[PDB]
């Protein structure tokens with residue numbers, strides 16, 4: 001199975017015609033998050049004009065970070081987000097704690113890419129040609145998982161094989177404010193937070209993707225709202241379900257994770273797209 | 282090692298005598314005002330003359346060589362480079378503004394579905410620079426490029 | 442016996458774009474070939490030395506049942522010989538002269554074959570301009586064979602063609618108007634007249650009075666005889682569009698109900714370009730030169746409207762090239778186009794190179 005990845009080049013997964021959005025580090029950070037929304041993209045590389053190279057990647061995590069790090073109140077402006085460049089914020093977020101750009105060549109194997117995702121604990125990996133130095137495509141877990149499912153022509157229970165995090169699951173409630181919830185994604189470094197009712201039963205899920213709605217609807221200035229109010233603008237699995245069926249359920253919905261739930265719809269663990277690709281590595 | 286011998290002029294009978302054929306009257310074939318003969322010769326120096334209707338001559342347009350005895354024969358230096366086509370073609374090689382073609386007025390960005398995915402562009406509009414009006418003192422730049430049999434439209438958000 | 446390869450050169454078949462074409466019968470087998478003769482001295486007299494190099498390169502790797510195959514190129518010190526496949530049938534033109542027009546079924550068969558070849562060329566970024574029934578030869582079994590690639594040309598990424606080559610009756614409006622073109626569109630117009638000629642036995646655009654011929658061509662106005670099938674009349678109306686943007690694509694022809702019939706298996710947020718300054722074109726060129734030099738960039742003035750500029754990178758210490766061309770949109774406005782010429786990102790370096798110029802320029 002993994003032998004298939006070590007053979008197939010990154011290039012094969014790049015679509016016939018794609019769109020890439022690049023922000024110069026000198027761009028005002030608020031303009032940058034609105035551009036991610038208008039262009040309908042979850043990640044954009046960053047070109048440092050002074051350095052004459054791609055120094056990094058701007059994602060929703062950066063928006064979650066600025067928001068939670070700098071939100072003072074609903075009554076006051078987040079003056080930083082409003083007037084701060086991507087470079088000014090990149091310096092604050094990464095002071096002594098520095099992290100360089102992680103990239104893959106289109107000639108390199110699909111395995112090299114999957115291994116580099118888990119190696120650096122990232123969801124967005126840019127593809128760069130060595131000679132040209134151009135960023136071609138942003139390789140995601142969902143795209144690799146899609147190509148792999150289209151290739152399958154194991155077979156045991158989710159409890160038997162034991163894949164993913166099943167201990168101390170980060171969660172929110174119905175009434176939980178967005179600010180509080182952002183603070184969870186910050187200290188825990190997780191992608192989504194299951195929303196639970198009056199009892200242990202899970203009614204919804206607030207993902208990092210549901211945070212771009214704040215940028216889109218320009219509502220980020222009020223993070224005092226409950227996670228349910230926030231989700232007003234618009235799936236689980238069982239421990240006895242087979243791995244092949246779980247992989248099938250995730251792709252026939254194009255979702256990053258599934259919740260391992262109990263008989264009375266109560267959370268017991270989680271299984272992310274990241275974990276499945278790791279087991280097959 | 283084939284060499285072309287051609288006599289541009291008229292005649293009832295034309296012949297070719299050469300070092301390569303021990304100066305024997307080899308006859309040339311007429312088409313129009315051209316009398317030809319193609320023959321394999323070793324890569325070296327060769328002398329030749331023509332016997333055009335009872336008269337010995339050389340092609341004045343072709344290189345000659347005058348003997349110590351006052352004999353004028355044409356000369357031919359069949360070089361190795363003359364044999365291979367691409368080697369020969371290499372040695373051989375030594376107002377008002379245009380109206381804008383309507384093709385450049387067709388983009389893939391403007392004309393549900395995946396926001397990243399785009400239509401295949403016409404080869405003709407690739408490498409061309411497109412830009413969106415400067416709003417809020419920030420310039421937007423775009424261009425579609427190709428890497429192998431795939432295309433990438435890069436958008437640059439650069440302040441000005 | 443005048444020999445080349447091992448074939449005995451015979452009678453002149455005709456005279457092509459750059460030289461005579463002769464028959465060749467093999468010394469032993471008797472197999473017949475067509476030999477194009479290109480005098481090295483005459484090919485250097487016209488500056489076609491490069492064109493011939495390309496012409497060979499292409500044809501030497503092509504292999505389609507409806508394109509005359511180039512077997513071998515023999516170089517001699519004097520001339521160059523192109524050994525090609527021979528077809529007994531001769532011109533399609535002469536066929537349509539002796540016999541009349543072709544019956545719907547027969548016309549369709551041949552048109553499918555020609556278009557197949559035309560597609561194959563375009564699929565290989567080669568555009569044979571000058572596509573006429575005179576350049577469509579037939580074999581003993583009545584198969585079309587595309588032949589004079591002397592006026593052909595390559596299709597480059599981001600570049601247009603200018604050469605107004607081909608016969609006036611078969612030439613596209615943009616070709617006769619001498620305007621710029623991409624390449625495939627001009628072959629489609631020619632394929633359209635070839636289709637007309639096959640069905641009607643006459644030319645759609647024809648007149649002794651040259652100005653009224655050119656008027657009709659640019660007015661895309663022709664006669665459709667009563668005997669013509671409305672479905673093929675719909676195909677011709679689509680192929681003979683004066684606007685290239687409204688013209689049929691090989692994909693649009695392939696999709697057509699007349700074409701498809703009995704078709705054999707074996708064949709087949711507003712963005713803006715550059716900047717638009719309304720000033721005098723001679724003054725815009727002087728302005729862009731005053732702008733490029735004010736940025737410390739080395740260039741080369743080709744046309745009085747085309748410039749090729751290079752920039753030394755202060756960080757990666759790599760030279761990056763880009764070309765500038767000024768076109769004419771309205772009768773009132775003109776626009777300046779920026780093309781990329783093939784470390785850090787080449788694409789981004791280009792964007793940054795252009796941006797500087799625009800920040801100090803009009804519309």
Ligand SMILES: Nc1ncnc2c1ncn2[C@@H]1O[C@H](COP(=O)(O)OP(=O)(O)O)[C@@H](O)[C@H]1O
Nearest residue numbers: 056057059060061062100101102122123124208
């Ligand atoms: N290739 C990369 N090189 C450097 N930093 C990166 C890269 N990709 C992402 N990052 C950083 O990793 C952090 C988390 O990003 P990520 O998990 O990919 O976001 P998302 O879940 O929205 O896709 C961010 O602070 C971002 O700047």
Ligand SMILES: O=C(O)c1c[nH]c2cc(Cl)c(-c3ccc(C4(O)CCC4)cc3)cc12
Nearest residue numbers: 310311312317443450451452461478480520
């Ligand atoms: O014509 C031109 O411009 C030529 C330029 N270079 C040439 C080289 C050759 Cl070899 C010939 C040639 C070839 C064959 C014949 C024959 O028909 C076979 C017997 C008589 C006649 C002339 C012709 C030209």
Ligand SMILES: Nc1ncnc2c1ncn2[C@@H]1O[C@H](COP(=O)(O)O)[C@@H](O)[C@H]1O
Nearest residue numbers: 164165169170190191192193270272274
């Ligand atoms: N809500 C959550 N609580 C705890 N762990 C989680 C949660 N969501 C995902 N994980 C785990 O976090 C890791 C990375 O997940 P992800 O960010 O979703 O790709 C994996 O080991 C997941 O199992």
Ligand SMILES: Nc1ncnc2c1ncn2[C@@H]1O[C@H](COP(=O)(O)O)[C@@H](O)[C@H]1O
Nearest residue numbers: 205207208209235236255256257258259
């Ligand atoms: N386990 C899940 N069940 C249902 N919807 C989910 C789940 N995980 C993510 N989503 C939805 O997927 C979107 C976020 O996308 P992503 O982070 O790519 O998975 C949001 O609309 C979430 O509600």
Ligand SMILES: [Cl-]
Nearest residue numbers: 454455456457
């Ligand atoms: Cl002829």
Ligand SMILES: [Cl-]
Nearest residue numbers: 464466471473
């Ligand atoms: Cl015969």
Ligand SMILES: [Cl-]
Nearest residue numbers: 528529580581
């Ligand atoms: Cl035949």
Ligand SMILES: [Cl-]
Nearest residue numbers: 537638642643
């Ligand atoms: Cl005719």
